[model samples]
Target: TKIVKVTGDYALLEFKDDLTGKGSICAETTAILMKYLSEKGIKTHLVEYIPPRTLKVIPLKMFPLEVVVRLKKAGSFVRRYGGAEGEDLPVPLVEFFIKDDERHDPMVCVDHLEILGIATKKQAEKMKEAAVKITLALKEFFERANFELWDIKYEFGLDKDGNVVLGDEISPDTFRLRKKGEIFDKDVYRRDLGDPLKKYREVLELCRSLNSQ
Candidate 1:
């Protein structure tokens, strides 16, 4: 039975646990994400205090547009666009989407948000400000380790106080970090780069050692 009071900081999710309570790890991941984004002065809609295990297993809100801040273009999109197999775009490209699903998620014109009535002129301006600033911060972080932050995605939402805060998880799943030009993420499994669990564990350990910025 689902038994918990709903609030901005907490949620009670009802779902099966396949790994015997391992789902609570989500709170730790959320905490790490919220801490970093907050340190960077990026307003996020996530909780301030520690998150609870109950917050997991629920369907997070699906955002309309996917804000992909790309420092380079060398991924699936490039393949779809008929770029040379291994070519990389020189400049950063901030791509937008109409939805988060597999279908109809193409890069739309910048004014699509205005046409959809999802963002006012001011809101759109603010989003650009937030995205640029945050992307720069992430870029610098990766530079310190000689990693190229090819791209990242972010979602946003309005809080009860009417503040537009980032509104999704910011874990490794959202970005790609190529250290010294080596992939060390989901690609280890998907692309057969190496053992997924080993690489992920190394990634997490390195993440644990990084001081919040």
Candidate 2:
């Protein structure tokens, strides 16, 4: 579990380390990302970073959906669409999925969301728009470090004023960041490339050197 909160209106996150069976490099990567993305106008739940493996965040009324924004074909997209995995798409694809383990995280249309009372058309549109904007912003941000952002997944929630804001950790786990044909995300574990923990640390160091442009 990534989140564990006390009696406050905030959440404390400690990412699970795969190698040492403790906190991992994912926390720092996410902390740096949320801070950078916040400055870039993508409001996130982050309140503060706690260095080695912790982040303080505002508690949010989370949605039952997950957002995925893709700039290229990979993973589920390739499996679902039957296309080449590395081919780049002209336009980004912003997709929504019902976040449920029972039904196996099925991708849903905006219409399906509304029918199930998950999100209204207006809210769904706003979230979809936010996903696309974030995708483009992150794509350019990672480009500075020569990391090609193939795609990313996100979650959104309502803040105090009920305004939509990005939630969850955006790290090597959630981002499809790659360079020189080397995978830098969870695909390393998913596809059994090498030690994901080592790759994650390299990702953190690279991200720490980047400044918002």
* Model 2 whole-model lDDT (C-alpha atoms): 0.81
RMSD of each: 5.3, 3.6
lDDT of 2 at 198: 67
Candidate 1, residues 1-213: lDDT per residue as tens digits?
123345545544432224343233434444555667678888765444344444332223334777887676567677767666335456566677767476867766557777777766566666667876777776676566576666788876655565566655554557776676564478545676544344334444445556342
- In terms of lDDT, the best-performing candidate is 2
**Least accurate 10 contiguous residues by lDDT in model 1:** 14-23
Per-model TM values vs. the true structure? 0.71, 0.87
Error of 2 at 66 (Å): 1.8
* Local distance difference test, each candidate: 0.58, 0.81
The most accurate candidate by TM-score is 2
* Cand. 1 TM to true fold: 0.71
Tens digit of lDDT per residue, candidate 2, span 36-55? 88878888989888877888
